[PDB]
Design a protein around this ligand. Structure first.
Ligand SMILES: CC(=O)N[C@H]1[C@H](OC[C@H]2O[C@H](OCc3ccccc3)[C@H](NC(C)=O)[C@@H](O)[C@@H]2O)O[C@H](CO)[C@@H](O)[C@@H]1O
Ligand code: UDP
Ligand code: MN
Length: 273
């Protein structure tokens, strides 16, 4: 009996002021977000969203960025009228970071909670500056963080697909998900670009003004040195995607914690094989 939410949300206020120089108390954020239900789940009370979105954050040792992420995104995602949940996929151990493998774990695990049909993949340190930048899926894969301050508020190259993106359930399945063997920094987002292009798709984007995005400045994380194999790996995507991704994935979930504003899945994703 509730009617469809309108196509575009009437609640959006467009551009927003974004800053990362004050402390954040998630207790307060939770109290400022009374409609967000345990585990960081929200759907509107007044209408049915067609956007059933699981937002997936690859994570290790960035608690400070996460509280900023939570503080800014939760109110925006509510104004966008999404039926959404947050998933922080926390890499166990202290071995080399694997961004794309976490994202896969995220897709697969989230699906167990709820019938999500859209996946937003978001780095922890990127915050949109305009709530017209929709954190849901389109008829083609969606690149969301299109004009980041750190790249001068434009794309750093036209095939860039890093930062924040969104794939529908079907688009993610169609590329066999993300690669598992990009260990350490660099290039997994280029490989994913390739995967989309090899399956007949193109990149949807908002304009540079709406897609304005802030990156929280930070120094290097240890255990994520540039991957020196990344260039050879991206040159073979077409062949390797056939058997490397969802259909070749295993992991062991160590812990699932429902916090009021996000579900955190701690996971053993292993070391290179
Ligand atoms: C492969 C990689 O390291 N990608 C990074 C990227 O690195 C800087 C790099 O970006 C462009 O090249 C991407 C690329 C894609 C396929 C094969 C080889 C390289 C850029 N190319 C152009 C035409 O402008 C090149 O000049 C640069 O050195 O940086 C981004 C943002 O930090 C990461 O998201 C990628 O993973
Ligand atoms: O030790 C790490 C390495 C990276 N990441 C996650 O992976 C993303 C991408 O890595 P990074 O911030 O280094 O990209 P950069 O800003 O250096 O280009 C981060 O936003 C986090 O979501 C993390 O949580 N812990
Ligand atoms: Mn970063």
């Amino acid at each position: 009996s509730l009617p469809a939410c309108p196509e575009e949300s009437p609640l959006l206020v467009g551009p927003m002021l974004i800053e990362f120089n004050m402390p954040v108390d998630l207790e307060l954020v939770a109290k400022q977000n009374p409609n967000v239900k345990m585990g960081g789940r929200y759907a509107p009370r007044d209408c049915v969203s067609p956007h059933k979105v699981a937002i997936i954050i690859p994570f290790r040792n960035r608690q400070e960025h996460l509280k900023y992420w939570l503080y800014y995104l939760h109110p925006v995602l509510q104004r966008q009228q999404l039926d959404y949940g947050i998933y922080v996929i926390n890499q166990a151990g202290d071995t080399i970071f694997n961004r794309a493998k976490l994202l896969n774990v995220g897709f697969q695990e989230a699906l167990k909670d709820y019938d999500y049909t859209c996946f937003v993949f978001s780095d922890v340190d990127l915050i949109p500056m305009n709530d017209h930048n929709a954190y849901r899926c389109f008829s083609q894969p969606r690149h969301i963080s299109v004009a980041m301050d750190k790249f001068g508020f434009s794309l750093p190259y036209v095939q860039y697909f890093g930062g924040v993106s969104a794939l529908s359930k079907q688009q993610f399945l169609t590329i066999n998900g993300f690669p598992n063997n990009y260990w350490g920094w660099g290039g997994e987002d280029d490989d994913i670009f390739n995967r989309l292009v090899f399956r007949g798709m193109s990149i949807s984007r908002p304009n540079a003004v709406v897609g304005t995005t802030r990156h929280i400045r930070h120094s290097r994380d240890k255990k994520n040195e540039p991957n020196p194999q990344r260039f050879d790996r991206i040159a073979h995507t077409k062949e390797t995607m056939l058997s490397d991704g969802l259909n070749s994935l295993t992991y062991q979930v160590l812990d699932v914690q429902r916090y009021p504003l996000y579900t955190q899945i701690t996971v053993d994703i292993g070391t290179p094989s």
